[PDB]
Design a protein around this ligand. Structure first.
Ligand code: PC1
Ligand code: 3PE
Ligand code: NDP
Ligand code: SF4
Ligand code: SF4
Ligand code: SF4
Ligand code: ZN
Lengths: 290, 178, 94, 114, 155, 143, 206
């Protein structure tokens, strides 16, 4: 331990939490909450970015003065990852697309980049690595995204055995591609909240009984896709996206879940009202099990 | 002694002459054409504008701008860590921490100023008994982060080395008034 | 003078360096460490010793004002010099 | 010893003023979640009112009770007239902070919290 | 190459966005008389393209001028939210930079950078209109140094 | 008295390095005035004067097109003005360096640096005081 | 002398005479009349004489103390009645000023004087908001300078300078939340008072 890490304070913005975290995937939708949960307790946060400096200004006010360090990188550029993993204790990976561009295939995104990230982490000498994947991650999958995810989890474990994989399900919040995707206009779903996911990850960042394990972060309830979409329409284009949509959520057996980090599920029936009022110009859904 | 505004010395006359004068004022819109004339006159003058980055506004040898930590001709520092600046600074913006140097002298190890707390009042250079801390002339030191305005001994000494060719002259100018 | 540490960081006029194992070195990444390269402890040593024919000498630093308070120093101890606590100068008795 | 009173002679009259104030609050509560688009449920709001009332139950002094009634009336004014906002009303629930654990061990382990 | 024309397109867009800066002047205190003096002839805010004061609903930049209190923070945040992207912010004065002469008070926000994200900090109590103008030109350059279309192309 | 105005104007136009210099000036500094060259600084900047203009426009400066490795043909800052000329340009004086030179002292910057608010050579703060509390380290051999 | 302030006794005489005048007219509601070195007249009274005394001074022909220059409170936590209350009053017919003081505490309110001077409508609200002192028969009495949900009276001597809470924007809930106070530089308490007595004229006995 180095005195610069001893968690002095009272758990607040201007405190110290001993958490030096290099986070990849902060410009997105879940990092926007991971970084807040990290910084509002007094943690140092290295954020690599490839975007323009305008798209990374919603993060300068979520951490105290001097705790946030924004630097630039390029996935294809190695030696731009040593800079960021060095001087850290924890690394968090949140990268992922819902589609394929020219330069970046699912293979690259979910297998080749995380592997180099974990390699550089191990080289540096960090002590925790957290990777996020999908609940339905499996090689047998209509979608090749999940195929690549289940491949990349192993490709990571092969370099960082003590890593921590986290498989949540369809996530719902503001600026999410699930409820807004449905409301833009045989299968059971158990969604989960970004708040819960971020709390879980930021807790695992310190909890000692989380290494070399996996976690299935799923909501408290389950719904039939039809009942859920009708609930959406009552409160109110990609092949792989539609494929991931037309897949039911597994009920992972005895896998260390969400309430094992300390978090508690927040039912969608409470945050749908705040997420959906934007798309305007009721009774709840009957929870079921198959 | 007092005066009256909006009071007439006595009643007026309802004579046809004055009534017609007021009716002309009303119909012909007389009191407004004079304002039009004022605006035209101003159009036909020279504006007070200046090219900023090329033409600069005038200042005085007393201007209080950016801070600087000075030295002696020898090159030795001046701050003897007496903390009068820290004790008078209204905004509690100066943090100081001193020690005996290996050569046995009263000198600082830490001298920090917070420009997001300084009200730029000059009390620190009024108090310094050695003319070591001075609120220099510079005002063009804006930034993009709140962390480039937390100064320190190094930044302030660099600013001193930078601006001494001007601070010294302004002090030579004004030191006979203080 | 600035002389670098194993980690590759310059040392200051008060011996400050982030230990190679320190996470606070991040702030310098893609950036620099502002350091002054003119060390008073050496620039004053570069100066010579003044000599006087009087066992007591007054120092002010230069200009009456623009210097420092007039202080009086004793020069009876030929073993060493007489140093000023303000300016660092040192005198001798001849 | 003997005192000069304020808006009451005894805790009975004080408590009936309190009950009138509770009537007013309890009744108004839902109009707030309607006017200002709060996420919480009327049940949560009413439980919160009950909690904030019982927080000052040990009180015995008619004067210390009349002053609390005064302040609650000020708040109810600020609320029914839309002078407060979603922020000021949600400043009651503390949705963005964990509490000091009520466990000697949970305190010891992290800090000097006594 | 497409890179040449994309660079030129970004340059043109940035030229427009930086030559037609319209400010919402959230003026709270004695760091606003200086903004007025900057609009005044000797500095002629309107000469670079920066209109005197426009509506908060069609503005591009937002100048926070003076002490921001805990009774005024929500209105400032609501204005920031109502404003249309792409939007920039400029903090004028010690009060808005770190709280200044009231940093240790109970009714002051120790920095507008806790309620909204800032791009350019101008120091002073108060900073001359010359310094505020310097800061606005620094913002102009910050805009001229953007690569939006480039990052969308090489994505 | 109008033809004299036109003559003053044509001489103000042709008073530069022909069309190229005229365009350079008119497009960097939106002004085509003619003044006396009091001096030029190490960094290539020029400083002009005319005492018949009004207070604030009787002195001005044409910045350099390059400063410490930077294309300043368009980008231009009042931070480029070194101190000795800053003091004469903001009218703290009636005397420029050429006649009233500064005091030649070491530890004064020979090369002036402009604002670096975002360049890679900018300022990053830190604590200058050493570690206070030294911990205990046990030996690397047991019992 | 050129460094000392002049000293006229005519004003001391006038104001002592008027003090006797006021005190013998209102032997009730009156105590501790005093006129000071710098020629200012204070009259201390009982909380039951506010409206009587203000009305007397405003309407009485010899007094005509019409303008309410200021209303103030002062916290001295070492006396049972800790909240001194001060009315600074002005008369133009005589070019004169006076101070009327009373006392209060928590739970022991004062009578409002909006009936006498309507300026107090806001001064009394300010006193209630800052020092926590209720007034009887005030139409509206509510937070005027502080935020809407502020819980405390901050101009007391026991309320901390920096407060108990602090505000900031949090993206999760998209609001300006309140939290405990965590500063990055604790305000420094400079102990300045000197050990050596500076004014013997005020030397308290042991
Ligand atoms: C109805 C029309 C609606 C559309 C509007 C019409 C557009 C008008 C064109 C205005 C262009 C002005 C250019 C800027 C200028 O004047 O130079 C001075 C500017 C100076 O601006 P400055 O910001 O550097 O500051 C000047 C210095 N001071 C302030 C001190 C005086 O020169 C530059 O700095 C660089 C200019 C960059 C922008 C150049 C645009 C590139 C050319 C565009 C072609 C794009 C299409 C190519 C692809 C084709 C598709 C297949
Ligand atoms: C053959 C013999 C008989 C023939 C019959 C005809 C005989 C002539 C009749 C006279 C005609 C009079 C002129 C007609 C228009 C008069 C209108 C008028 O008088 O408006 C009155 C009104 C003010 O009224 P009031 O408020 O009561 O005055 C203050 C009281 N103390 O005033 C106003 O409010 C006006 C507001 C004006 C504000 C804008 C002013 C801008 C002026 C710009 C210059 C315009 C010049 C004209 C431009 C021509 C366009 C090509
Ligand atoms: N929500 C869901 O349905 C579920 C999501 N997850 C996981 O959640 C994580 C994040 O979700 P979300 O927040 O929606 O992701 P977002 O798309 O919101 O943002 C993710 C980040 O990935 C970065 N990124 C993506 N592709 C590249 C690339 N080729 N090169 C560099 N950076 C890249 C982007 O950086 P920039 O914005 O700068 O390009 C972006 O900020 C994903 O990793 C996903 O696997 C897991 C289970 C369920
Ligand atoms: S000028 Fe600034 S640093 Fe100096 S005493 Fe005044 S507030 Fe403090
Ligand atoms: S007053 Fe001057 S000498 Fe004393 S501590 Fe401050 S800067 Fe140093
Ligand atoms: S920084 Fe100074 S001048 Fe500016 S608003 Fe605050 S107190 Fe007023
Ligand atoms: Zn000396």
């Amino acid at each position: 331990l180095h005195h610069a890490v001893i968690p002095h304070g009272k758990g607040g913005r201007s405190s110290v939490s001993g958490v030096v975290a290099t986070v990849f995937g902060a410009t997105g939708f879940l990092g926007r909450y991971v970084v807040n949960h990290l910084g509002r307790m007094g943690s140092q946060v290295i954020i690599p970015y490839r975007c323009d400096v305008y798209d990374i200004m919603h993060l300068r006010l979520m951490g105290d003065l001097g705790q946030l360090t924004f630097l630039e990188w390029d996935a294809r550029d190695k030696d731009s990852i040593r800079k960021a993993v060095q001087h850290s204790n924890v690394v968090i990976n949140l990268i992922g697309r819902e589609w394929e561009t020219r330069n970046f295939d699912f293979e690259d995104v979910f297998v080749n980049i995380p592997r180099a990230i974990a390699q550089a982490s191990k080289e540096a000498g960090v002590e925790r690595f957290i990777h996020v994947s999908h609940l339905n991650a499996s090689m047998k999958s209509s979608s090749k995204s999940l195929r690549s995810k289940a491949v990349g989890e192993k490709e990571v474990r092969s370099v960082f055995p003590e890593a921590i994989i986290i498989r949540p399900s369809d996530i719902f919040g503001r600026e999410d591609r699930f409820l807004n995707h449905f409301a833009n206009y045989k299968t059971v779903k158990q969604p989960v909240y970004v708040a819960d996911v971020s709390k879980g990850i930021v807790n695992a960042t310190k909890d000692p009984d989380a290494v070399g394990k996996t976690f299935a972060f799923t909501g408290p309830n389950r719904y039939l896709l039809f009942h859920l979409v009708k609930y959406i329409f009552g409160m109110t284009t990609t092949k792989d996206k539609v494929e991931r949509i037309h897949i039911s959520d597994v009920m992972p057996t005895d896998l260390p879940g969400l309430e094992d980090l300390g978090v508690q599920p927040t039912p969608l029936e409470l945050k749908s009202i705040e997420v959906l009022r934007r798309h305007r110009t009721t009774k709840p859904a009957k929870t079921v099990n198959y | 002694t007092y005066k009256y505004v909006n009071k007439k010395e006595q009643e007026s006359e309802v004579d046809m002459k004055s009534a017609t004068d007021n009716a002309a004022r009303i119909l012909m819109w007389t009191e407004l054409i004079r304002g039009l004339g004022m605006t035209l006159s101003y159009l036909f003058r020279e504006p007070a504008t200046i090219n900023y980055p090329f033409e600069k506004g005038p200042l005085s040898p007393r201007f209080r701008g950016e801070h600087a930590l000075r030295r002696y001709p020898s090159g030795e520092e001046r701050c003897i860590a007496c903390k009068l600046c820290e004790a008078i600074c209204p905004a509690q913006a100066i943090t100081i921490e001193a020690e005996p140097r290996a050569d046995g002298s009263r000198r600082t190890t830490r001298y920090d100023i917070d420009m997001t707390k300084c009200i730029y009042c000059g009390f620190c250079q009024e108090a310094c008994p050695v003319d070591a801390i001075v609120e220099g002339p510079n005002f063009e030191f804006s930034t993009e982060t709140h962390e480039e305005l937390l100064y320190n001994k190094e930044k302030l000494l660099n600013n001193g080395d930078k601006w001494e060719a001007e601070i010294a002259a302004n002090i030579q100018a004004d030191y006979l008034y203080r | 003078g600035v002389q670098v540490s194993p980690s590759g960081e310059k040392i200051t006029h008060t011996g400050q360096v982030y230990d190679e194992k320190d996470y606070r070195r991040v702030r310098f990444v893609d950036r620099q460490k502002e350091v002054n390269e003119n060390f008073a402890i050496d620039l004053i040593a570069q100066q010579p010793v003044n000599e006087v024919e009087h066992r007591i000498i007054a120092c002010d630093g230069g200009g009456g004002a623009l210097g420092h308070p007039k202080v009086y120093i004793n020069l009876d101890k030929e073993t060493k010099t007489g140093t000023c606590g303000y300016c660092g100068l040192q005198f001798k008795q001849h | 010893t003997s005192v000069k009173p304020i808006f009451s002679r005894d805790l009975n009259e004080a408590k009936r003023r309190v009950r009138e104030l509770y009537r007013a609050w309890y009744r108004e509560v839902p109009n707030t979640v309607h006017l200002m688009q709060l996420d919480i449920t009327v049940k949560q709001g009413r439980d919160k009112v009950r909690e904030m009332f019982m927080k000052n139950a040990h009180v015995t002094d008619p004067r210390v009770v009349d002053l609390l009634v005064i302040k609650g009336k000020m708040e109810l004014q600020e609320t029914i007239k839309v002078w407060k906002q979603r922020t000021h009303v949600m400043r009651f629930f503390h949705e963005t902070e964990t509490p000091r654990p009520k466990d000697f061990l949970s305190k010891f382990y992290m800090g000097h919290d006594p | 190459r497409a890179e040449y024309v994309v660079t030129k397109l970004d340059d043109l867009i940035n030229w427009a966005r930086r030559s037609s800066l319209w400010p919402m002047t959230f003026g709270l205190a004695c760091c606003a008389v200086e903004m007025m003096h900057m609009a005044a002839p000797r500095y002629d805010m309107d000469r670079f393209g920066v209109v005197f004061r426009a509506s908060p609903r069609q503005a591009d930049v937002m100048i926070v001028a003076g002490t921001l209190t805990n009774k005024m923070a929500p209105a400032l945040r609501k204005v920031y939210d109502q404003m249309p992207e792409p939007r920039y912010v400029v903090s004028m004065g010690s009060c808005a930079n770190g709280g200044g002469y009231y940093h240790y008070s109970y009714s002051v926000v120790r920095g507008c950078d806790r309620i909204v994200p800032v791009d350019i900090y101008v120091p002073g109590c108060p900073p001359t209109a010359e310094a505020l103008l310097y800061g606005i030109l620094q913002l102009q350059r910050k805009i001229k140094r953007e690569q939006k279309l480039k990052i969308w192309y090489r994505r | 008295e109008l033809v004299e105005v036109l003559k003053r104007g044509v001489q103000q136009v042709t008073g530069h390095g022909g069309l190229r210099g005229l365009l350079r000036v008119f497009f960097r500094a939106n002004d085509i005035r003619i003044g006396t060259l009091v001096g030029e600084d190490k960094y290539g900047n020029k400083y002009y004067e005319d005492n018949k203009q009004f207070f604030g426009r009787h002195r001005w400066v044409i910045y350099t097109t390059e400063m410490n490795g930077k294309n300043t043909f368009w980008d231009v800052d009042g931070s480029m003005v070194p101190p000795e000329w800053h003091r004469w340009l903001h009218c703290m004086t009636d005397d420029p360096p050429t006649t009233n030179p500064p005091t030649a002292r070491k530890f004064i910057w020979t090369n002036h640096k402009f604002n670096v608010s975002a360049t890679p050579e900018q300022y990053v703060p830190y604590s200058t005081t050493r570690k206070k509390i030294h911990e205990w380290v046990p030996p690397s051999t047991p019992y | 002398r050129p460094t000392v302030r002049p000293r006229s006794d005519v004003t001391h005489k006038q104001l002592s005479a008027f003090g006797e005048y006021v005190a013998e007219i209102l032997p009730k509601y009156v105590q501790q009349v005093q006129v000071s070195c710098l020629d200012e007249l204070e009259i201390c009274i009982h909380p039951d004489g506010v409206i009587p005394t203000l009305t007397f001074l405003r309407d009485h022909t010899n007094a005509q103390f019409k303008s309410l220059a200021d209303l103030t409170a002062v916290d001295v936590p070492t006396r049972q009645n800790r909240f001194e209350i001060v009315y600074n009053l002005l008369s133009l017919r005589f070019n004169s000023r006076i101070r009327v003081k009373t006392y209060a505490d928590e739970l022991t309110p004062i009578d409002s004087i909006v009936s006498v001077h309507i300026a107090a409508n806001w001064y009394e609200r300010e006193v209630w908001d800052m020092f926590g002192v209720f007034f009887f028969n005030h139409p509206d009495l509510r937070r005027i300078l502080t935020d809407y949900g502020f819980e405390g009276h901050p101009f007391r001597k026991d309320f901390p300078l920096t407060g108990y809470v602090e505000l900031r924007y949090d993206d999760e809930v998209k609001r300006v939340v309140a939290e405990p106070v965590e500063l990055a530089q604790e305000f420094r308490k400079f102990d300045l008072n000197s050990p050596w007595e500076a004014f013997p004229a005020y030397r308290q006995p042991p």
